[PDB]
A paper describes a structure:
Transcription termination is an essential step in transcription by RNA polymerase (RNAP) and crucial for gene regulation. For many bacterial genes, transcription termination is mediated by the adenosine triphosphate–dependent RNA translocase/helicase Rho, which causes RNA/DNA dissociation from the RNAP elongation complex (EC). Rho is an adenosine triphosphate (ATP)–dependent RNA translocase/helicase with 5′ → 3′ directionality. Rho forms a ring-shaped homo-hexameric complex, mediated by the CTD.
Cryo-EM maps of Rho, apo RNAP, EC, and type 1 and type 2 complexes are shown. For the cryo-EM analysis of the EC-Rho complex, the EC was prepared using the same DNA/RNA as in the RNA release assay. A 125-nucleotide RNA was elongated by adding ATP, cytidine triphosphate (CTP), and uridine triphosphate (UTP), and the EC was stalled at the first G stretch on the DNA. The EC holds a transcription bubble containing a 10-bp DNA/RNA hybrid within the RNAP main channel. The EC is stalled immediately before the G-triad of the template DNA.
Residue numbers in the entry:
A (entry chain K): 2 to 92
B (entry chain J): 909 to 1236
C (entry chain J): 2 to 55, 81 to 114
D (entry chain I): 1 to 761, 785 to 1119
E (entry chain J): 1363 to 1505
F (entry chain J): 512 to 795
The structure:
RNA sequence: CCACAUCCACCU
């Protein structure tokens, strides 16, 4: 499978919410680019033939490994949505 | 069955990744040891027990007796047909028992017997047809032929016996080719009628439930006995207790999902004779607008944990009901 | 821009039918064999359904016509349904 | 290499010509060979003499008498070779001699008038219609005659049915209603039969002493005595009861249309309807049907016997005299001849109506040749029957066995008014009368189960759709060589023994003999036996008879093995099975695929393409060979020479091999060393593990020919020219396109390479190799407007067809199977080094999973494996009948001899028993396989008797624990079309109405997602996957375009929009008086279209 | 086979009642039990006027239950387009997009699974962006 | 409720297409519309010229029948095409209703872009979360992703060059295979069996590039699908969006679906051969 | 261009 699906299910009330969180994190990682990650310093995905898993081979694994750590928060309404949603599309 | 229980226990007590790794290891080692063990099927592996021989003779003698019993006018056509059918269906079971006893006693490592004991392939009826006899054959009219098939596939079937078995072959082919369509139509009906059910919920204040019985109300004219373990498991496993119940010194709190261990404990307690009905929540009493709530739905899923909110339980329910219909 | 929330189905008035269509067809001439272009004001007229040459041809996928009958007629659905709606 | 046969049965008669049904039917239909003066009249001449001779008494210019004298046909316009090369019809023009007579003077006789071209049967038994060849399959239906059926509701009485043909005609139904009503419903309205009986000239007194003498139900008809006292005006009231509105003074309008010819069936005299009449009831049925018209009055020969017989059965009991609907003696076969004759007489009736109309319009008389008969209706009817009919279907030339089976198939279906797909459950089951006439195993699985079947090997339709089974006459205790072909009704009266009963030559050797009283297995004495089965082979079809050990197989796997024997491709070097049944030589001989010497002689010249043979009479004949002929299904048909220059040959001796014959023996497959053991995982459930030895030597290899075709046609922009030069770009790739427009022969072509260069109005529209595979160009044919004898589709100036051949080899995609229904797909091709091998250096070729044996019931393959193991060392072949094969002691003795030879060869070099063999033997001793206390010599011998030998792993070198069963199996590669090829596309053609993508020839086309897959997808929590797969990847054109551009740009796909299918649905709703619009959260309409719906 | 699925189907089988004592509608008409419950709660408690809508549960087959539904899209696409479309055309049937079949027809997001409003939107921000916006929040809370 | 003006469907919804040699294939909608237009024009002309009452009434009945036949065919009589082809014309209701109608072709999404199908073979060396995909069909299915990946590096200057490079297989290179392997490192594909009886008929897998024509399938899922290896084929689909990729990899991956939804019985249980081997090793 | 009809097969 993928690293720690059991604790990923444990830290969320429903699997569908986990899917929404991981996919939204992946979309952010794409459209921002991979700069705003919380796993930059040492713990990063390791590619086989080179270190190609530095930049962008597959972002779902990035989002999952990023959510495995405790630097992420998710909720129904945690931040004023209007400002960030208007800054999401107009930049 | 041991492997299935092992897999279920590993999934319950370990999780997802560990169960998958265990399955991979089991598959790899099973392949390697099946290869090195050398299981082969020859014509001599379909051993014909000698005792069954005289069994036929005995039946034949009894057959002759029934024959003369008909020529004296003591029996009617229906009575004679019933007697012949009962005699042959009894000697068939006797031959099957003798075949399996011979396999147990003389050749424990016989490929046919080894495959039959394990869940690999085959059934006792198929093993009997290979080594014993495929006696009773159904007529196209729906009844059964009076004359059975004495020979087996280890021996050579007579032309008439093969022509008779072609009846059953054609019946099976046509029955599959039409019952598949009927089952598909039923599945479509159920999916369309049930497609609107989705678990969207805050826990509904339902002070209602259903009492699942634990005893068969009528197996004889007037008697009570405990239901089969499979039926009780299919009725109780993964449900939510309506109200707190203490049956064997253990307090099963209200609102607790019934795991497999709880079902086993309840079955043991019912065997001891403490309770007869289990009050549990059910979708039938749920008050949700369009669907059922998490509590009233239950606990059984692809995983073990309680159902996630937002799952389309209606379509999976319809698929679960309709899938076995094609193999019925 | 607004999201779809409900789908309403109802009867269409003759005014609605005339509002839908852009002109009326009168000739039962689909397309001439020699001239691959549309023949006349019939079922494939150029000016009644839009340009056939690359607005794109997609307008012809959505523009509708209409026929003004000199005699009124009733929908077969409302007269031949098992409960005859006009009949009830 | 010797051939050893096991069965002890004297086949008194050999197999009849396996394709004689269609050939004899067509030869009886068309009597071209015999002079027209001959007495033979049934067939096309029957139709001519029945319908054509129109007579006109008084209608304007009366006295019209157009009579038929003779018909002839003797010359096909072209031989069949270019009738296949060019899309013509191998037909013959039909000429008829007509003559016209009027009431005045005049003999206007035209000896020759052309009326349509009728197709001619080829030598094998097929027809060529438009280039390709088709077969017309026989039909089974209710035989015409008089039947009796129990009432669906009333249990005391029943109904009688006299059934003529066609449907637009009589269908007489007699019912006895308890109020004393003899109801007779002819077409749609019931009728008291008493009035018709009175019309027939029968009074009450003869009805009393001829019908009511024995039965008390005559009061059910004699009660109506108030109205039975009229000779002739009863006919007038009978016509008045009808509702045509016509005046009652029409004596022979409808009362006589049920007379001689028009309405009543003209079923063939004696057997078609008379045998169903004369045998069932009465004594004889004089004439064709019930009528007299020489005195105005009417006569009967059916109504009175039918009433007498019905009253006898309903009151008394002459016998259990109720006809079964599915009894094969009451069912009749319309062969190709009968169907062709029916369609021909339909066309003749159309021509008769046309000529009657022309005569009515025409004024003068000297107009017999042209102004009367026109060939258009009859020719159109014949062409429609031979092209668009349901029973005239594409020939299956995968192999000679496939063609033969397709030629001898019987279908319950047909035009549509007889039997139909959706509901046929009652008639799908086999019947007790199918024994010896219809194969109970040959039916194809699927929707067409039970409806379509094949007749038995010894089965034979005699003259009128009545299958007859051969039976040996038994007188007392001696079995006579006399053989009689019997029908089901004839068979139901005697006791028939079995072929397996012990015999002392010409004497029954058993006391208790198994027999069939009436389809019922009983045991009797030899003195009560009248008939004997000729052979077990008469119970199964030709295809089913090829399975050696059928007696040890399940019916279902035997069915599918027989079915898959049809679809086995011919191999480059195919060899006959080690274990045979004995019909292979008969199959290859009767199927006209090989060459045989017609007379004793000596071969003169032998080449790769023709053989010149000089016979004993001094006449030399040249036999050409279809060297590489593409079949209907794309396989290769080859005749390989099998004789040497200056070699003496006998009559009927083999000259050249067929497409799938080794030496006069049906060889479609290979003989390979098979080990029945489970390998690692590569034979898991039904998969198959094969050696690389089978690939290092070309052992499973077939030539496949694909025929591409492209035409240049005259367009309004200008004619398209097949020219070498390409307009815009391709000149580097033009090297392969050697000549003008056509690619050179022998040039390999890959996908995307030009085959034919065509230029449209200039624009490049050239035929290229489609994505997938391409091989070697072998042939190219060009047809132009300069027609020697060819005809083309109007508007098309020319056409070119290119045949590309490739040499397919066995790989993972392919599937293999044996004659016992053990299907399998090659899963891995192992190298030679790591496969299991014998104690000798020889390794096994194929490894089969044993778990497929006990789950199903196919033990015949195990016996075949043991016998092949014996024959591999003995170097000989075995022929064993299906139900008289080799007994287990015989196979054991053969295995003992084989082990003697094998281990003697082993000891010849001075070797004993390996230590690995020692440990294997001790382990088997612990398993009870071998008796203890014996030396490894006889222990290994006893193990060999079981058919199991010690194998070595090869990967590890250590022996496989426990003995392994190995032998020789006949494994054949099944038909392999594009099914394995990956129809994987990413972007292709889209449909017009909806934008859902579907391609085909250009691109593979999208995979179905249906609703069950949708239900499964939304059973999960997947919502965005379904959203994109219904709109982004399926229909939303702007969405799919934007997604494609974004993916190219390496960005996330955009949000999907409303699919075009919903827009189509909305517009179709708006086409009706309906009104559908999408609404916002409030009651504000939202336009799904951008602005296109809004006007301007 | 477990009993949850059969119970779901049986509940959907008899989700219909027909009233005996009329309230604000006709008597011998059958429709959703839950709608009648809402009407009774509105009539007795929420609004003034004690008019008991005395109903009885009606058990109808799977086909009849599937055909007679509030949403006309599923009924039209299921068994018989003609009758369902005629009935939905007599009275303007504003099909609320509840149920998976209608959303499949329109191609929009499925209400079940990921599309459920319970989990449809879930804002996700990493630690540093959350800290920045929360610093903005607490500096908006002056002093 | 009765209609005075009859709507007319857009032309592309009832197109006339050249087939070969100038012949036109047309939907029955065009024929019905032509008949209605001709009959209405005849009625207008007849009403304009004169009023023979019986002829006018007959023409009114005829026009009403034509309108009814256009709206729905078969409810009264059976109007047919030109004589010689007795196939009833297809009306609006036939387009809508039926087992093959507009509702039963848009509810289903009968066609998909990024999809393929092939015969399946056993995959014993594969892990449970993996499937074997032939490299040619894998390259074809992931074509736009491959184009983008090789545009990232120096294989091709622009996407047109990459497409013309990949259009002919004689230009295949090891760098292209390496790029294709890099593309599908984290992607998953949906495998499907033709009869989708239950939820497990669709399963996500991690593709592994293999040499051959068949799809390698893990033996343990031989029971989740009703798929043996006697020649049956399975289909493969490729989700595109990262949202759908996460969905498939989380809640449709075969590694996460080990137990039935109908009951608690597992479906990833050891199969026939594994059971046989484990029984043989653990027997006394 | 692929529409529809008919037929034969393959996997359940
Ligand atoms: Mg299969
Ligand atoms: Zn609830």
């Amino acid at each position: 499978a993928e690293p720690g699906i059991d604790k990923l299910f444990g830290m969320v009330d429903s699997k569908y919410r986990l899917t929404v969180v991981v996919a939204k994190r992946a979309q952010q990682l794409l459209r921002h680019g991979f700069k705003n990650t919380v796993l930059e310093p040492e713990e990063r995905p390791k590619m086989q033939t080179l270190e190609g898993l530095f930049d962008d081979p597959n972002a779902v694994t990035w989002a999952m490994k990023e959510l495995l750590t405790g630097r992420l928060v998710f909720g129904e309404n945690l931040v004023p949505e209007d400002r960030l949603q208007k800054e999401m599309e107009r930049l | 069955n041991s492997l299935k229980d092992l897999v279920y226990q590993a999934f319950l007590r370990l999780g997802m990744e560990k169960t998958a790794r265990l399955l991979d290891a089991l598959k790899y080692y099973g392949f390697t040891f099946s290869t090195t063990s050398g299981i082969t099927i020859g014509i001599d592996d379909a051993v014909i027990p000698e005792e069954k021989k005289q069994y036929l003779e005995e039946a034949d003698r009894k057959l002759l007796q029934i024959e003369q019993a008909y020529e004296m006018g003591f029996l009617t056509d229906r009575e004679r047909y019933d007697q012949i059918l009962q005699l042959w269906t009894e000697t068939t079971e006797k031959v099957t028992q003798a075949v399996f006893k011979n396999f147990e006693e003389n050749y424990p490592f016989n490929p046919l017997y080894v495959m039959a004991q394990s869940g690999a392939r085959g059934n006792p009826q198929q093993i009997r047809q290979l080594c014993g006899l495929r006696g009773l054959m159904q007529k196209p009219s729906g009844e059964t032929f009076e004359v059975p098939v004495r020979s087996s596939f280890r021996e050579g079937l007579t032309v008439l016996e093969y022509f008779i078995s072609s009846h059953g072959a054609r019946k099976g082919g046509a029955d599959t080719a039409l019952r598949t369509a009927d089952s598909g139509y039923l599945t479509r009906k159920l999916v369309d009628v049930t497609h609107e059910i989705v678990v969207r919920e805050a826990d509904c204040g339902t002070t209602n439930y259903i009492s699942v019985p634990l005893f068969q109300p009528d197996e004889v004219t007037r008697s009570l006995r405990l239901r089969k373990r499979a039926d009780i498991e299919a009725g109780l496993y993964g449900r939510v207790l309506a109200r707190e119940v203490e049956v064997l010194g253990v307090r099963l709190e209200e609102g607790r999902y019934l795991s497999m261990d709880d079902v086993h404990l309840l079955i043991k307690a019912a065997e001891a004779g403490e309770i007869q009905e289990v009050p549990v929540r059910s979708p039938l009493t749920c008050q949700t607008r369009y669907g059922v709530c998490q509590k009233c739905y239950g606990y059984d899923l692809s995983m073990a944990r309680p159902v996630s909110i937002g799952e389309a339980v209606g379509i999976v329910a319809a698929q679960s009901i309709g899938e076995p219909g094609t193999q019925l | 821009k607004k999201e779809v929330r409900k789908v309403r189905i109802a009867l269409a008035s003759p005014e609605k039918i005339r509002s839908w269509s852009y002109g009326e067809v009168e000739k039962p001439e689909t397309i001439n064999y020699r001239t691959l272009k549309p023949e006349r004001d019939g079922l494939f007229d150029e000016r009644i359904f839009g340009p056939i040459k690359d607005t794109k041809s997609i307008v012809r996928r959505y523009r509708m016509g209409h026929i003004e009958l000199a005699t009124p007629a009733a929908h077969i659905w409302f007269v031949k349904d098992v409960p005859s709606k006009i009949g009830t | 290499m010797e051939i050893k046969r096991f069965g002890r049965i004297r086949e008194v008669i050999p197999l009849p010509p396996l394709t004689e049904i269609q050939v004899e039917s067509y030869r009886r239909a068309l009597q071209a060979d015999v002079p027209p003066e001959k007495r033979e009249n049934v067939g096309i001449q029957a139709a001519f003499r029945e319908t054509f001779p129109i007579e006109e008494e008084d209608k304007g210019k009366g006295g019209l008498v157009l009579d038929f004298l003779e018909y002839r046909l003797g010359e096909p316009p072209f031989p069949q070779d270019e009738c296949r090369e060019k899309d013509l019809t191998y037909q013959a023009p039909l000429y008829a001699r007509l003559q016209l007579i009027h009431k005045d003077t005049g003999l206007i006789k035209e000896d020759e008038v052309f009326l349509g071209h009728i197709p001619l049967m080829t030598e094998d038994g097929s027809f060529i219609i438009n280039g390709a060849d088709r077969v017309i399959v026989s039909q089974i239906h209710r035989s015409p005659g008089v039947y009796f059926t129990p009432d669906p509701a009333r249990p005391g009485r029943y109904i009688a049915s006299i059934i003529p043909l066609p449907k637009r005609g009589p269908w007489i139904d007699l019912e006895v209603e308890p109020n004393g009503v003899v109801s007779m419903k002819v077409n749609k309205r019931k009728f008291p039969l008493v009035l018709l009986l009175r019309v027939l000239g029968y009074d009450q007194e003869t009805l009393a002493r001829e019908l009511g003498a024995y039965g008390e139900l005559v009061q059910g008809l004699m009660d109506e005595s108030v109205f039975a006292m009229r000779p002739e005006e009863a006919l007038i009231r009978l016509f008045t009861l009808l509702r045509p509105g016509d005046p009652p003074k029409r004596d022979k309008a409808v009362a006589y249309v049920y007379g001689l010819i028009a309405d009543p069936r003209r079923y063939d005299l004696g057997e078609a309807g008379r045998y169903k009449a004369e045998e069932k009831l009465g004594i004889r049925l004089s004439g064709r049907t019930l009528a007299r018209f020489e005195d105005g009055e009417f006569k009967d020969e059916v109504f009175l016997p039918t009433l007498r017989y019905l009253f006898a059965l309903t009151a008394g009991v002459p016998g259990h005299e109720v006809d079964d609907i599915d009894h094969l003696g009451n069912r009749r076969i319309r062969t190709v001849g009968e169907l062709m004759t029916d369609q021909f007489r339909v066309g003749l009736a159309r021509l008769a109506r046309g000529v009657r109309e022309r005569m009515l319009m025409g004024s003068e008389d000297s107009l017999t040749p042209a102004k009367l008969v026109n060939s258009r209706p009859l020719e159109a009817a014949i062409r429609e029957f031979f092209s668009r009919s349901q029973l005239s279907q594409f020939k299956d030339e995968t192999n000679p066995l496939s063609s033969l089976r397709h030629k001898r198939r019987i279908s319950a279906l047909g035009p549509g008014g007889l039997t139909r797909e959706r509901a046929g459950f009652d008639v799908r089951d086999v019947h007790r009368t199918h024994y010896g006439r219809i194969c109970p195993v040959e039916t194809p699985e699927g929707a067409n189960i039970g409806l379509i079947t094949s007749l038995a090997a010894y089965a034979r339709v005699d003259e009128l759709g009545f299958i007859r089974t051969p039976y040996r006459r038994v007188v007392g205790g001696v079995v006579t060589d006399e053989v009689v072909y019997m029908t089901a009704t004839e068979e139901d009266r005697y006791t028939i023994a079995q072929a397996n009963t012990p015999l002392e030559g010409n004497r029954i050797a058993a006391e208790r003999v198994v027999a069939r009283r009436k389809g019922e297995p009983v045991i009797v004495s030899p003195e009560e036996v009248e008939f004997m089965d000729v052979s077990p082979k008469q119970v199964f079809s030709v295809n089913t008879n090829l399975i050696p050990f059928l007696e040890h197989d399940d019916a279902n796997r035997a069915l599918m093995g027989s079915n898959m024997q049809t679809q086995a491709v011919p191999l480059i070097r195919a060899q006959a099975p080690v274990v045979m049944t004995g019909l292979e030589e008969r199959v290859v001989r009767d199927s006209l695929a090989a060459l045989y010497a017609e007379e004793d002689g000596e071969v003169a010249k032998v080449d790769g393409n023709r053989i010149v043979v000089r016979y004993e009479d001094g006449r030399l004949v040249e036999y050409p060979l279809r060297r590489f002929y593409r079949s209907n299904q794309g396989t290769a048909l080859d005749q390989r020479p099998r004789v040497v220059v200056g070699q003496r040959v006998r009559k009927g001796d083999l000259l050249a091999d067929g497409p799938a014959s080794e030496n006069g023996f049906l060889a479609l497959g290979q003989n390979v060393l098979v080990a029945i053991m489970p390998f690692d995982g590569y034979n898991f459930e039904d998969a198959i593990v094969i050696s690389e030895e089978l690939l290092k030597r070309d052992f499973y290899t077939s030539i496949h020919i694909e025929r591409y075709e492209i035409e240049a046609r005259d367009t309004k922009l200008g004619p398209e020219r097949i020219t070498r030069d390409i307009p815009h770009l391709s000149e580097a790739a033009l090297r392969d396109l050697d000549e003008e427009g056509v690619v050179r022969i022998g040039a390999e072509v890959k996908p995307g390479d030009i085959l034919v260069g065509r230029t449209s109005f200039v624009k490049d529209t050239s035929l290229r190799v489609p994505p997938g595979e391409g091989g070697i160009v072998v042939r190219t044919v060009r047809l132009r407007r300069g027609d020697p004898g060819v005809e083309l589709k109007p508007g098309v100036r020319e056409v070119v067809r290119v045949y590309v051949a490739q040499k397919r080899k066995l790989q993972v995609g392919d599937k293999l199977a044996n004659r016992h229904g053990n299907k399998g797909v090659v899963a891995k091709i192992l190298p030679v080094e790591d496969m299991p091998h014998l104690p000798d250096g020889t390794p096994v070729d194929v490894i089969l999973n044993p778990l497929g044996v006990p789950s199903r019931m196919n033990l015949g393959q195990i016996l075949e494996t043991h016998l092949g193991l014996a024959g591999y060392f003995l170097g000989q072949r075995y022929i064993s009948p299906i139900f008289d094969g080799a007994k287990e002691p015989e196979i054991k003795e053969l295995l003992a001899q084989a082990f003697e030879v094998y281990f003697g060869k082993r000891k010849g070099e001075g070797f004993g028993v390996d230590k690995r063999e020692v440990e294997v033997l001790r382990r088997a001793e612990k398993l009870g396989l071998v008796t203890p206390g014996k030396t490894p010599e006889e222990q290994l011998k006893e193990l060999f008797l079981q058919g199991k030998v010690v194998l070595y792993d090869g990967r590890t070198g250590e022996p496989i624990e426990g003995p392994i069963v190995v032998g020789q199996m006949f494994i054949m590669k099944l038909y392999h079309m594009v099914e394995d090829k990956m129809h994987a596309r990413s972007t292709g053609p889209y449909s017009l109405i909806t934008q859902q993508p579907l391609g085909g020839k250009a691109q593979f086309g999208g995979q179905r997602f249906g609703e069950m897959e949708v239900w499964a997808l939304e059973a999960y929590g997947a919502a965005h996957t379904l959203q994109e797969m219904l709109t982004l990847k399926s229909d939303d054109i702007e969405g799919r375009n934007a997604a494609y551009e974004a993916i190219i740009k390496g960005e996330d796909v955009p949000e999907p929009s409303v699919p075009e299918s919903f827009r189509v649905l909305v517009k179709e709703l708006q086409a009706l008086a309906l009104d559908v619009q999408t609404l916002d959260e409030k009651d504000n309409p939202v336009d799904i279209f951008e602005g296109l719906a809004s006007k301007r | 086979l477990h009993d949850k699925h059969i119970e779901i189907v049986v509940r959907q089988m008899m989700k219909y009642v027909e009233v005996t004592d009329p309230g604000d509608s006709r008597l011998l008409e059958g429709q959703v039990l839950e709608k009648w419950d809402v009407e009774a709660l509105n009539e007795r408690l929420i609004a003034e006027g004690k008019t008991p809508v005395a109903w009885k549960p009606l058990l109808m087959g799977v086909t009849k239950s599937a055909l007679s539904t509030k949403s006309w899209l599923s009924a039209a696409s299921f068994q018989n387009t003609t009758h369902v479309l005629t009935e939905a055309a007599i009275a303007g049937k504003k099909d609320e997009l509840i149920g998976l079949k209608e959303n499949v027809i329109l191609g929009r997001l499925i209400p079940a699974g990921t599309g459920s409003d319970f989990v449809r939107f879930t804002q996700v921000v990493d630690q540093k962006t959350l800290k920045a916006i929360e610093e903005a929040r607490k500096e908006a809370v002056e002093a | 409720m009765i209609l005075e003006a009859v709507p007319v469907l857009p032309p592309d919804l009832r197109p006339m297409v050249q087939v070969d040699g100038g012949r036109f294939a047309t939907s029955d909608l065009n024929d019905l519309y032509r008949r209605l237009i001709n009959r209405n024009n005849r009625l207008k002309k007849l009403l304009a010229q004169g009023a023979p009452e019986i002829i006018i009434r007959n023409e009114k009945r005829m026009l009403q029948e034509a309108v009814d036949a256009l709206l729905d065919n078969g409810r009264r009589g059976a109007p047919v095409t030109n004589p010689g082809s007795d196939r009833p014309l297809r009306s609006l209701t036939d387009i809508l209703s039926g087992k093959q109608g507009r509702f039963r072709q848009n509810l289903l999404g009968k066609r998909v872009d990024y999809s393929g199908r092939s015969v399946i073979v056993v995959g014993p060396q594969l892990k449970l979360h993996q499937c074997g995909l032939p490299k040619r069909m894998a390259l074809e299915l992931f074509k736009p992703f491959l184009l983008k990946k090789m545009e990232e590096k120096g294989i091709a200057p622009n996407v047109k060059a990459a497409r013309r490079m990949l259009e002919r297989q004689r230009d295949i290179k090891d760098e292209v295979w390496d790029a294709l392997e890099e593309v599908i490192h984290g992607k998953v594909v949906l495998l499907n069996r033709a009869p989708t009886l239950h939820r497990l008929g669709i399963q996500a897998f991690q593709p592994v590039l293999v040499e051959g024509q068949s799809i390698q399938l893990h033996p343990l899922v031989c029971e989740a699908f009703n798929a043996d290896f006697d020649g049956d084929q399975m289909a493969v689909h490729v989700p595109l969006s990262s949202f759908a990729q996460a969905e498939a990899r989380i809640q449709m991956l075969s590694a996460h679906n080990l137990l039935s939804p109908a009951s608690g019985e597992p479906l990833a249980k050891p199969s026939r051969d594994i059971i046989l081997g484990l029984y043989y090793i653990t027997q006394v």
